[PDB]
Amino acid sequence: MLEKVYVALIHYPIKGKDGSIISTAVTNLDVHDIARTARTYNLKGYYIVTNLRAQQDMVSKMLKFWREGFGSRYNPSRAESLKLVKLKSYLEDVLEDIESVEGERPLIFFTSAKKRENDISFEEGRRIIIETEKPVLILLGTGWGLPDEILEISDYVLEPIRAQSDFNHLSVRAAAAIIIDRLIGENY
Amino acid sequence: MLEKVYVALIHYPIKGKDGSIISTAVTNLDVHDIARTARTYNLKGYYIVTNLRAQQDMVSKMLKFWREGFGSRYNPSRAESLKLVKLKSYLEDVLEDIESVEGERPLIFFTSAKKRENDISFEEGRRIIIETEKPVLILLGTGWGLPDEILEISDYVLEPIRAQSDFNHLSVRAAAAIIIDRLIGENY
Ligand SMILES: C[S@@+](CC[C@H](N)C(=O)[O-])C[C@H]1O[C@@H](n2cnc3c(N)ncnc32)[C@H](O)[C@@H]1O
Numbered sequence: 001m002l003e004k005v006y007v008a009l010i011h012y013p014i015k016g017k018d019g020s021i022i023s024t025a026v027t028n029l030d031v032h033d034i035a036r037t038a039r040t041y042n043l044k045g046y047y048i049v050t051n052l053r054a055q056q057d058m059v060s061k062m063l064k065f066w067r068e069g070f071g072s073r074y075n076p077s078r079a080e081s082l083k084l085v086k087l088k089s090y091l092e093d094v095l096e097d098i099e100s101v102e103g104e105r106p107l108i109f110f111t112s113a114k115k116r117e118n119d120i121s122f123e124e125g126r127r128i129i130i131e132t133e134k135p136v137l138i139l140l141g142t143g144w145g146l147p148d149e150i151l152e153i154s155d156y157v158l159e160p161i162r163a164q165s166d167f168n169h170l171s172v173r174a175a176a177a178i179i180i181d182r183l184i185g186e187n188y
Numbered sequence: 189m190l191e192k193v194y195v196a197l198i199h200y201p202i203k204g205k206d207g208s209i210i211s212t213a214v215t216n217l218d219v220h221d222i223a224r225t226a227r228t229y230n231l232k233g234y235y236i237v238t239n240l241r242a243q244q245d246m247v248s249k250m251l252k253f254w255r256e257g258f259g260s261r262y263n264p265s266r267a268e269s270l271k272l273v274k275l276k277s278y279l280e281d282v283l284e285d286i287e288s289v290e291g292e293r294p295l296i297f298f299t300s301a302k303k304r305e306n307d308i309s310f311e312e313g314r315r316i317i318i319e320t321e322k323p324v325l326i327l328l329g330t331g332w333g334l335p336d337e338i339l340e341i342s343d344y345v346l347e348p349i350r351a352q353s354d355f356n357h358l359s360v361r362a363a364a365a366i367i368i369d370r371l372i373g374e375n376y
């Protein structure tokens with residue numbers, strides 16, 4: 001059900017340009033942007049996943065500015081949307097947290113512009129979320145996309161958005177928005 | 189039809205916090221982000237509308253870096269998506285440009301998180317785009333939203349995304365993504 005859906009923005013492990021594994025910087029706008037989308041569709045949590053202590057520090061400081069500091073008193077909803085945000089160092093820590101919260105490890109939905117074998121449609125994904133009592137975790141990449149090691153542990157790969165177009169390389173913010181709208185939509 | 193749809197990001201006239209009319213800075217990521225969304229869904233053009241010469245200069249320089257300069261040789265598709273981008277000083281200049289291109293002034297679709305009287309659903313909007321031979325222009329706001337003077341000249345107001353939610357204050361990048369997916373979707 002729609003009150004048990006999570007999203008995670010992955011910064012490590014991430015594919016580099018030579019796809020080697022890299023660890024990306026967190027772009028500040030990604031935190032605010034995807035938090036607002038998650039909040040709008042009543043998702044349970046938004047995880048920012050990064051093993052870079054400099055990034056963890058920047059995100060933590062930013063979070064308390066907007067959640068506790070001056071920022072929390074001149075927005076309203078920066079802070080409302082940002083309450084959903086949790087920082088974690090690794091995907092495994094995300095999985096462990098959801099298991100603690102939900103009593104159960106989540107179904108993992110891999111996302112990619114690049115067509116994979118054995119994927120599901122968004123209609124098929126919506127059906128799963130409707131019919132399941134399991135928590136669902138939507139994974140979003142940075143850099144040059146989510147790596148094979150994460151693909152290997154994903155339960156489902158959602159088909160690419162606009163797979164038959166001549167161009168479908170969306171930002172992660174635009175992709176997240178569309179993915180969440182297709183899966184949750186105007187259902188309350 | 190889907191090969192005659194435009195999007196414009198409005199920075200002036202825009203509602204300020206006291207909603208007074210203000211002129212907003214163009215956030216660089218908005219140019220790249222919404223260009224990719226427009227390109228993915230095969231929209232005809234993406235207008236960046238700003239009457240601030242400092243903003244027009246920053247955007248122009250950025251455009252040629254990615255379209256002509258070094259940027260054009262180490263992406264592929266930054267430059268592909270950015271080809272859709274046109275800078276204009278005023279909404280009127282956008283309308284005038286589309287009239288020159290299409291032989292006809294466009295139908296204007298106003299967008300807002302805030303519920304208005306006399307709006308259309310996305311289903312109703314999709315129908316218009318399917319059945320029309322007129323160009324369509326989707327307007328997106330910055331700051332605290334599109335002002336009444338722009339509302340007054342809009343042919344249609346699309347209903348808010350997630351109007352019945354307790355929170356629907358999306359970023360313009362996330363909103364644009366969802367609006368475009370709802371109107372165009374997986375239609376080729
Ligand atoms: C490759 S990353 C980096 C993209 C870009 N450089 C940016 O500024 O965000 C984009 C991420 O968004 C998601 N994404 C982008 N396009 C998508 C599509 N067409 N279908 C499904 N997911 C997509 C995937 O999760 C992907 O890992």
Ligand SMILES: C[S@@+](CC[C@H](N)C(=O)[O-])C[C@H]1O[C@@H](n2cnc3c(N)ncnc32)[C@H](O)[C@@H]1O
Nearest residue numbers: 300301328329330332333348349358359360363
């Ligand atoms: C008010 S502006 C500024 C929002 C935010 N400060 C940002 O960083 O983008 C957001 C714009 O995105 C569009 N928008 C946002 N939420 C929307 C919604 N729920 N339904 C339709 N359009 C929306 C509107 O065009 C609006 O003018």
